[PDB]
Amino acid sequence: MIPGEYHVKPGQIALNTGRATCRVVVENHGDRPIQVGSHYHFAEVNPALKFDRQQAAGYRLNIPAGTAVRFEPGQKREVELVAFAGHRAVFGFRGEVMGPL
Amino acid sequence: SNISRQAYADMFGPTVGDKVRLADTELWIEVEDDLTTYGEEVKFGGGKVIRDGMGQGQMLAADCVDLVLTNALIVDHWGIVKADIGVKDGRIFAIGKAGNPDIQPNVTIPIGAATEVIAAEGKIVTAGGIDTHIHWICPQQAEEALVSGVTTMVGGGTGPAAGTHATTCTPGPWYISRMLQAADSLPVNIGLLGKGNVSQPDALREQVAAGVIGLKIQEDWGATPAAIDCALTVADEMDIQVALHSDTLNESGFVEDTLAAIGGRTIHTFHTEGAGGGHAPDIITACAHPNILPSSTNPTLPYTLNTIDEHLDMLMVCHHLDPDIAEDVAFAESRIRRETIAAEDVLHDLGAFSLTSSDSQAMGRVGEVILRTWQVAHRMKVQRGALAEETGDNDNFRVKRYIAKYTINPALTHGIAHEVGSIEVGKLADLVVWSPAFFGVKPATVIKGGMIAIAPMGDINASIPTPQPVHYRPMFGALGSARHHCRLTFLSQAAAANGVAERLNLRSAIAVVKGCRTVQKADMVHNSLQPNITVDAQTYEVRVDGELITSEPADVLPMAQRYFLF
Amino acid sequence: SNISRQAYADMFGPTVGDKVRLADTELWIEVEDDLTTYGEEVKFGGGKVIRDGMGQGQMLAADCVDLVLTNALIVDHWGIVKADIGVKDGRIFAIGKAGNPDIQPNVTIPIGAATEVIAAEGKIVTAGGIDTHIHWICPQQAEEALVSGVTTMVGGGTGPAAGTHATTCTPGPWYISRMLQAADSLPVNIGLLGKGNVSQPDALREQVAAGVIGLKIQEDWGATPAAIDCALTVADEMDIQVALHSDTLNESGFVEDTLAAIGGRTIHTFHTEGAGGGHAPDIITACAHPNILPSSTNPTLPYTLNTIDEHLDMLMVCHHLDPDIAEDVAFAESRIRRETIAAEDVLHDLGAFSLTSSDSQAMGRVGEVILRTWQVAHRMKVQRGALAEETGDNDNFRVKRYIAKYTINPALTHGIAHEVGSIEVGKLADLVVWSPAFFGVKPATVIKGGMIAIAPMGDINASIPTPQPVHYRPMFGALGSARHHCRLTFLSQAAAANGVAERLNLRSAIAVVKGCRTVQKADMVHNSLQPNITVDAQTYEVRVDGELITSEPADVLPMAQRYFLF
Amino acid sequence: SNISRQAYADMFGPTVGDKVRLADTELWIEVEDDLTTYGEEVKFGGGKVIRDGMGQGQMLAADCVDLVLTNALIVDHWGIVKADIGVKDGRIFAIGKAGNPDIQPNVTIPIGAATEVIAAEGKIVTAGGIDTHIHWICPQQAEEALVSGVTTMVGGGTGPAAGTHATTCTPGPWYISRMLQAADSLPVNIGLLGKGNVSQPDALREQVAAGVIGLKIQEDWGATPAAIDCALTVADEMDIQVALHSDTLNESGFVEDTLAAIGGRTIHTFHTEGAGGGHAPDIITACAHPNILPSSTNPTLPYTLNTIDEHLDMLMVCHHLDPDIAEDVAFAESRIRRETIAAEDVLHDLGAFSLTSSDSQAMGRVGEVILRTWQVAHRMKVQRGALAEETGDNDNFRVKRYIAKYTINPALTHGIAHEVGSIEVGKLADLVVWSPAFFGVKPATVIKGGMIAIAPMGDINASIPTPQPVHYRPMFGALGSARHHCRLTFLSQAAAANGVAERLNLRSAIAVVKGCRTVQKADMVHNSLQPNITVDAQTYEVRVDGELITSEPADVLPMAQRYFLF
Amino acid sequence: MELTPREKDKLLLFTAALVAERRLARGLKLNYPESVALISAFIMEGARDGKSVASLMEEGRHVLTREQVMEGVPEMIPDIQVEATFPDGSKLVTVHNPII
Amino acid sequence: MELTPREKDKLLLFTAALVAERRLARGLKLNYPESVALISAFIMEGARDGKSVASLMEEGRHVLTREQVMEGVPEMIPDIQVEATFPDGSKLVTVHNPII
Ligand code: NI
Ligand code: NI
Ligand code: NI
Ligand code: NI
Ligand code: NI
Ligand code: NI
Structure with a gap:
């Protein structure tokens, strides 16, 4: 008996189902670490991260909401992205879109 | 992913x-x-x-x-x-x-x-919980209730005075006005009850026009058929609720006589089990009627080992009774019955009793309405198993039935469900x-x-x-002002119309009660049972359709010693 | 039956x-x-x-x-x-x-x-008791006094400032206004006193017009004949009361000179015995005059074993005196006399002293005015027996004489007896x-x-x-608002007329003082004695009609260790 | 004589x-x-x-x-x-x-x-001290700060909510209005900050017009170049101040990118050292710029033996980070550096850091702003001796330099120096x-x-x-009313013009902020140094003109165990 | 701890009892507040131990005797009442004529 | 003494701990508030003694064991945090899983 205990049923949850995804190789060319969040518009991340920005347009990291991927200096790795939904209007970040798409 | x-x-x-x-x-x-x-x-x-x-x-x-x-x-x-x-x-x-x-x-x-x-x-x-049996004995009760999870408090009183110690009544226009003004300082929604014990309707209309959202009939002020009728007549006129604490002494008649005086009109019966007051020993039979919205005060919830023992002296102090006067002690004892106390728990589980309340500092604990409601649910599951309405391997329905007792049902009963509940x-x-x-x-x-x-x-x-x-x-x-903007003071339709808020310069948001006369037992969410209930005059045994309704007293309870320092 | x-x-x-x-x-x-x-x-x-x-x-x-x-x-x-x-x-x-x-x-x-x-x-x-010697050193005093049974507090101050520590003065229009506004938050009736020490009448009229119901003359601000005369002149004009703490140092003259400056005009003498301040060592002779309303502060009531011992350091801290400065200590010692302290008790029993007060946190205990008044009565019955006015085998008259000291008499003295007392x-x-x-x-x-x-x-x-x-x-x-409706803020007739309440937006009920100049010793209920009293300049012995007036110090007192935790 | x-x-x-x-x-x-x-x-x-x-x-x-x-x-x-x-x-x-x-x-x-x-x-x-980094997590903070000697509190929040736990933001018109009304109850001067994280200027103008005197940019709400630019544009328009907690993650760019986004516009950098938040590990380089008004939060002041040890868990709780999530702990650790913590103390002594603040209950102690500022001064004198500007055998200049950090400088930075400071x-x-x-x-x-x-x-x-x-x-x-007359609620010029005070019926004195955009590093009293500072990306060593800037951690500090009961 | 107002209020009673406890230890005859505090605290601990309301109503009458308190004190306390969390929840304990 | 609000607040914690201390002495299994109060007070005294934050973060995990508290209590306290005046000023002590 543990007060307020959970009885979680076993299994897994499939995240962001039915959405377009794509994988890209990213490399941190900066001398300081860079960490990216789950919903940040990937195409507008720190310029020190070298990758195909054109492909990442309208995409974010396909990871559990609230988590992040960290890139130490010189670190190269392949990440999976998932496309934005809703109105697919990008506002903010580095101010490169500021509108639909 | x-x-x-x-x-x-x-x-x-x-x-x-x-x-x-x-x-x-x-x-x-x-x-x-x-x-x-x-x-x-x-x-x-x-x-x-x-x-x-x-x-x-x-x-x-x-x-x-x-x-x-x-x-x-x-x-x-x-x-x-x-x-x-x-x-x-x-x-x-x-x-x-x-x-x-x-x-x-x-x-x-x-x-x-x-x-x-x-x-x-x-x-x-x-x-937020809604307690409809508050005795305004002291302002500190508001913080205690808020901390427990109760956000709305309906009751009556003027402070630690004899009348308020025993009854939920704010007597007359002057006191009603003062308490409405004082309400602006408390962090909970408030609605007041006036003294409904009188046989002159105008004396009641004045109180309603002054600001009360209901009238309390208490035996200490005389719960006679004439007073009951008078209050219900004004209630039907002004769309306010009546709370009843019947004639325990059977002085003016028995329970059936009181039920006759009510005449099928909507009424909220306080502590329907009896210990807190009411026709001895069968006031509990009231839950069988369609026009009765029955509630329980918390000292009897749930039935435990020490329940009976603590009641006698509690009773005496509250109602200003003299332990040296034989008739005073005899009448106190006639209110405490293991039989009705045990049955009350089961009746809640069955949905025959629709509300739970405190009866703050007058045979009730202001910070224990929610806590005790869940202890009853626990004890009932332990003794009776799953409810007939339960689906799946969980207690979802029982939980819904019990949470309604201190949230939506109290709101419906007092005509404030359009705002809270x-x-x-x-x-x-x-x-x-x-x-x-x-x-x-x-x-x-x-x-x-x-x-x-x-x-x-x-x-x-x-x-x-x-x-x-x-x-x-x-x-x-x-x-200060933030509080005034986040709380509500409930007024009767009459008071609101007469401009009571502007006159008293009340600073909090104002809400009006409505739908008090049209609510009936069938409207109580998950608690609309009208059982064919009887009480044996000599043995006090409670029976529904001839079956004996009873339960066992708990020796230990959850939500108790593991959480409190004292 | x-x-x-x-x-x-x-x-x-x-x-x-x-x-x-x-x-x-x-x-x-x-x-x-x-x-x-x-x-x-x-x-x-x-x-x-x-x-x-x-x-x-x-x-x-x-x-x-x-x-x-x-x-x-x-x-x-x-x-x-x-x-x-x-x-x-x-x-x-x-x-x-x-x-x-x-x-x-x-x-x-x-x-x-x-x-x-x-x-x-x-x-x-x-x-409810009425304390007329309040130093508004802190707002907490109000609750302490209310708990003791005092419902009206008259005094002056602005908080824990040097001036207020020593005197009952709320200096000037700005502070007077601020304190009047602050008064709405306290659960007791309040009346303020301004600084009466000045030889320019206009400086006083401003304060009265601002809201004070009286003027305090204190030696720390200069209790000179010129200042005393100036204050009394304005008092006679605006119907407000004057409270006096005379020149202990005998710097501007002796007691007779001060009495001469007063010129038969109505005045309330604070701590007339002397310890709390006043012409050393004969300020106590003031109680012989018809225009003097004499009161006592509570540390000297009643005369006990530890009374003398505790006074020196209390005196020093209150009046900002330096124990290293010989003249400062000499002047402190000249105020503490066993002779006058002992006589004071008897003078109260005889009705020569008409009021009792605290002198809150400035050589007085705010929660002990009522308590100490009854201890004096007890000690006097014990030492002197029944009063001459006593009929029957009871202490009814003595009780009436003493209760008047902190109720009706203080009210009469400050012109508020039409409202309370x-x-x-x-x-x-x-x-x-x-x-x-x-x-x-x-x-x-x-x-x-x-x-x-x-x-x-x-x-x-x-x-x-x-x-x-x-x-x-x-x-x-x-x-909040309930409090505002149940308390009174006393204003001078001038302030009330000038619309001070509306200007400052005071929310409590307002009452005006009147009849301050016409009250005399003969009007003090059960305490109108004007004794032929003298004080020996060298020995400090007090005599009434040549008889030595004295008493014995109590070793133990009632209303003490049986009731308090500390 | x-x-x-x-x-x-x-x-x-x-x-x-x-x-x-x-x-x-x-x-x-x-x-x-x-x-x-x-x-x-x-x-x-x-x-x-x-x-x-x-x-x-x-x-x-x-x-x-x-x-x-x-x-x-x-x-x-x-x-x-x-x-x-x-x-x-x-x-x-x-x-x-x-x-x-x-x-x-x-x-x-x-x-x-x-x-x-x-x-x-x-x-x-x-x-009176001025704390400009207040998280309105609870109203009790006001009394704690007042007792320490702080009389003005600038910050944001709505109570113990997740957003407020981590940021100094009062989100939107409704909350801004409620908090302004609540401010009347607190005994300190108050100015509010709204949520500045948005790329739509109108969403910001609304908040300013509602009453805030500044906008807070926090990384938890997204401290991106677009948001920063948007806030600064509105700030320049409405004459309000911007407080910044930069992108620690270097997600949108490095420190130089953020500095580029700011574009030479006036801005107040919170906890410039880094532990409290900011580009890892070089946000401290911000103090080299003329348009930056840099401040420090107090947990890192001064560098002591236990400083590092207590920071990890403090960090996690404040920003709602999960210790089980590797990236969450890695990002917490990247903020705690002995190198920058040690250098911060020296930079204050040199006048490179101009303000000290708390960061109340969000990686900061509300009652320790003044106390910790003097402990740094003490530790710096002990380690570095007299300042170059010091004349005579005293610490007069160092004292003037340090007192300015929590008085006049915070006032200048937020445009309230015309009223306090x-x-x-x-x-x-x-x-x-x-x-x-x-x-x-x-x-x-x-x-x-x-x-x-x-x-x-x-x-x-x-x-x-x-x-x-x-x-x-x-x-x-x-x-009550005395308080309202003795405190100030700061409003933006826009809010004051729109009649926000009359609409919300604010009872305290109102003051308007101005001169927020024209203040620069050169205006900071005794703290205008703009050092040629660098931070090693791998070792985190701080250097000014190539010289290593560092200090030793204190084992014991004054103003500590000799004064406090706990 | 998440202490509610009532828990904090009881801490006041506990502390008042500590004062009385130490004075009784010195051999002093207890006064009115000291006696009430001592007996009340005793009952609260009894509840924590798991004793029944019935047991405490009796035990509470044997904490202090007439010879351990000042004159008049027994008559000033016709009864003592206090509530505490028993294993079965909050209950009221009323001790009549606790000092004999 | 010139006690600030925070000092007075800590007095509440100290008193709550006295309650727990005496019950533990009786041989009772402590509940939720009692356990939190006891461990917290221990840490405060440690700070007064001059112990380091690092030392206390460890020592605090050995004040109470699973067998000295009621069932479920250890799980109700994933950590305990308290601040006190160390020789080098106020510091935060966080004890993870204090009861094992
Ligand atoms: Ni009742
Ligand atoms: Ni009731
Ligand atoms: Ni005086
Ligand atoms: Ni005085
Ligand atoms: Ni920050
Ligand atoms: Ni912050």
Whole structure:
């Protein structure tokens, strides 16, 4: 008996189902670490991260909401992205879109 | 992408199919539905989702909510679901999926720059409780009740005076006016009851026109057929509720005579079991009638080993009885019966009794309405097993039946359900956030009209709000003008029309009661049973359809010694 | 029907001929009269008298009282009688027989649906005390005084500042305005005193026009003949009172010179004995004059074993004196004299000294005015026996003489007796209910303007208000708008006329002072003695008509260690 | 006549040439000037100077001050001088020589009947502190800060909600309005900050028009270049200040990118060292720019043995990070660096960092801003010796440099220096009186707008205010209407124009912010250094002009265990 | 701890009892507040131990005797009442004529 | 003494700990508030003694064991946090899983 205990049923949850995804190789060319969040518009991340920005347009990291991927200096790795939904209007970040798409 | 259900539960709280134990009881609830889109849950913190352009949009204040409770597990009479809650203008805006429509799907609760966030993942959110049997013996009761999770208090009194010690009555225009003015200082919604014991209707109309939302008939002031009739007549006229504490002495007649005087008119019977007052020994038979809205006070909930022992002296002090006067002690003893006390618990489980209340400092504990309601539920599951209406391997229905007792039902009974009583769109945002381990005992946050009014708070000088000592302290929602904007003072339609608020210069938001005469037993959510109940005049045994209704006294109870320092 | 007097006393409290001991003192009071009709007493509770059609009538609110104190034993300057007390519109309606005229005889206080009940059987009820020597060093003093039974506080100050530490002065229009606004937050009636030490009348008129009801002359600001004359001239003009703390140093002249400067004009002499300040060593001779209203501060009341020992350092801290400066210590020592301290007690017993006060946190204890007054009475009975005016075997007259010292006399002296000071019809309902065993020490209930403002209260979550811990907590009469309606802020006639209340937006009820210049020693109730008193310049011995006036120091006192935790 | 300097010091406090140790530190201040005329000093008490015709004149209220602080030793950014302080209409009237011009020479501060006196001989008087990094997590913080000597609090929040736990943001018009109304109940001057994280300018303009005096950019809400630019644009338009907590994750770019986004526009960088948040690991390089006003939060001040150890868990709780999520812990660790923590102390000593703040209950201690600032000064003197600007054998300049950090500089940075920030003529009378032995730790008196708001107070029932227990209790300046008159609620020029005060019915005095966009590093009093600073990306070593900047951690600190019970 | 007002209120009673406990230890005859506090605290601990209301109503009458208190004190305390959390929840314990 | 609000607040914690201390002495299994109070007070005294934050973060995990508290209590206290005045000023002590 543990007060307020959970009885979680076993299994897994499939995240962001039915959405377009794509994988890209990213490399941190900066001398300081860079960490990216789950919903940040990937195409507008720190310029020190070298990758195909054109492909990442309208995409974010396909990871559990609230988590992040960290890139130490010189670190190269392949990440999976998932496309934005809703109105697919990008506002903010580095101010490169500021509108639909 | 995939994630295990356990990791998911740890991150965003439980989802569909997961079960949670309520505090240290044997009651388990199962998430019935989840309104989120897996992968799109909103979370606040460094590097999280709720950030500009991401989980937070570009909309102006008018197009977004003021407050959002993320990943909340709602427990209400209509369901036990996982969802985000949006609050706007101090009221419940929506229950659904929060976020930014610019990049997220299915957003029904828009988050913008004008939105504050309360993280409810792993927490249970319920509506604020409503106690309708308050004796205004002292103002300190308000804070005690608020801390327990009760946000609305209906009752009567003028302070620690003899009349108030025994009855829930605010006698006359002068006292009614003074108490209405004093109400502005308390962090809970308030509605007052006047003294209904009189056979001259004008004496009652004055009180209603002064501001009371109901009239209390108490035997200490004379619960005679003439007084009862007079009060009910005025009630039908002015759309206010009548609360009854019948003639225990059987002086003017027996229970059937009182029922005859009521004549099928809507009435709320206080402490229907009897210990708190009422025709000895069969006032409990009142729950069989369609026009009766029956409630229980909390000392008898639930039936335990020490229950009987503590009652005699409690009774005497409350009603100003003399232990040296034989007739005074005999009448006290006639009110305490193991038989009716045991049956009351079962009647609640069956839905024959629709409300739970305190009877604050007058044979009742103001901070124990919610706590005791859940102890009864626990004891009933332990003794009777699953309810007939229960589906699945959980106690979802029993939970819904019991939560309705101190939320929606009290609101319906007193004509305030249009403002409070449940987590529904348009209602005042009176919400209580609980950690599963402390559910019904000690809340994590108490929100009054959209603002946190009280919550546990650690060292004020600490680097974070969590260091010890952690104890309940009033927040901004309980301060001066902010408080006035986040609380409601209920008035009768007559008082509101006469401009009582402007005359007394009441500063809080005003709400009017309505629908008090049309409510009946059939309207009590999950508690509409009208049993063919009888009480043996000599043995006091309670029977429903000839079957004996009884239960066993608890030796130990959950939500007790594991949580309190004293 | 018949009933034994003992059973009767236990049920309705004592009646004509019965005696009651005041707390643990040797003072006994005897019920002089009973205004009831035996058999028709009103009692509240289950199955009692005050019920519809019975002890409660059918009259509308306008035709009945708001509150009734049943079976109260009144102790006031005019008598010690048993009666019911009726309160209506926050004021004393009547003293007589309560009930329902429909079925009861001799009812003078009608009880109806709009009537609240306070059971006073077995209790003693007195008027709220009035302390006229308050140093507003901190706001907490108000609650301390209220708890002791003092409902009106007159004094001056701006907070813990040097000037206020030593004097009862609220200097100038700005501070006066700020303090008047702050007064709305305190649960006691308040009247302010300005700084009267100046030789320019206009500087004084400004303060009076600003709101003060009196002017304080203190030696620390220069109690010179010129300043005294200036203040008295303005006082005669604006109908306000002057309080004096004379020139201890004899710097500008001796006591006779100060008396000459006063020129027969009405004046209230603070701490007339001398320890608290005044011409050394004969300021006490002031009580011989007709225009002097003499009072005592409480540290010297009564003369005990430890009295002298505690005074030196108390003196120094209060008046900002330096113990290293010889002249500062010499002047402190010249104020402490066993001779005058001993005589003061006797002079009170004889009625030569008419008032008692505190001198809060400036050589006086704010919560001990009432307590110490009764200790003096006790010690005087013990040493001097019965008073010459005493009739019967009781201390009724001595009690009346002493209660007048902190009730009616202070009210008369400051021109507020038309509002408060005694239990008389038309006066504000400031009443204190006491249990005989705790009389003068710890009250059962403190009523401000018709509402209970503070009272001992037990466990807030308890089933009744009596469980421990029981300690004083503020009630509804001390909350926001209710408080404003139940308290009074006294203003000078000039301030009231200039619209000061509207300008400062004061929210409490306003009362104006009047009759300050016409009151004289002969008007002090039971304390109008003008003795032919002298003080020996070398020995400091006090003599009245050549007889030496003295007393013995108490080693132990009642109303002390049996009641307090610390 | 002559008097020894020691006797003089004991009587009127120290004079020109005398030195005083600040609390138990190694910091010594030397009286630079004395504005008195030897022999004409004013002193209050029995037989002292301030008396009618003597040290007190015959002038009307309009021609004299309301309050005078006698013989005060002022410590302010402009000097450490001995003088009398005059206060009139709640504001600083003059700094000079008080008395009566009728008989005394060089009187610049006239004392009359309308003047109250506060004896400051032997005491140090400073301006009230200004904390600009307040998280309104709970209202209790106000009293804690007031007790420490802070009289103005700028920040944001809505109570104990997730958003407020991590950020100083009051999100949107509704919450802004509620908090402005709640502010009237707090005894400190208040200014609010809205949520500046959005890329739509209108969403920001709404908040400013609603009442906020600044906008907070926090990384938890997304500190992206787009959001930063948007906020600065609105700031330049509406004359409000921007506070920044940069992108620690380097997600949107590095420190240089953020600096680029700012584009030379005025901005206040919170916790510039980094631990409290900011580009890892070089946000500290921001102090090199002319448009940056850099401040420090207090947990890292000063560098001690236990500093590093306590930070990890503090960080996690504040920002809602999960210790089980590797990326969450990695990002927490990247913020805690011994290198930058050590350098910060030295940078303050050099004047590169201009302000000190708390970051109340969100990685900061609300009652320790002043205390910790002096501990840094002490540790720096101990390690680095005298400053280059220091003249004479004293620490006068270092003291001036450090006091400016929590007084005038915070005021200049947020555009409120026209109202508060220093002891200068015309400014609001927010003053703190200290006993040298308790300087910076526990004040003797805290004055808000001319009235004592809080101070240590002994036994309320005592014969004097000094007997134990002595603890801080609220005074008249913190009561109802008096409080409203003695405090200020700062509004944006837009809000003031739109009539927000009248609409919300705010009762306190209103003040408007201005000059937020024109202030630059060169304007920071005694703290205008713009060092050529660099941070090694791998080692985190801080260097100024190639020289390594570092310091040693303290094992024991003054103003700690000798003063606190816990 | 998340202490509610009632829990904090009880801490006041506990502390008052500590004062009485130490004075009784010195051999002093207890006064009114000291006696009430001592007996009340005793009952609260009894509840924590799990004793029944019935047991405590009796045991509470044997904490202090007439010879351990000042004159008049027994008569000033016709009864003592206090509530505490028993294994079965909050209950009221009323001790009549506790000092004999 | 010139006690600030925070000092007075800590007095509440100290008193709560005295209650727990005496019950543990009786041999009772401590409940939720009692356990939190006891461990917290221990840490405060440690700070007064001059122990380091690092030392206390470890020592605090050995004040109470699973067998000295009621069932469920260890799980109700994932950590305990308290601040006190160390020789080098106020510091935060966080004890993870204090009861094992
Ligand atoms: Ni009842
Ligand atoms: Ni009731
Ligand atoms: Ni005096
Ligand atoms: Ni005085
Ligand atoms: Ni920050
Ligand atoms: Ni912050």
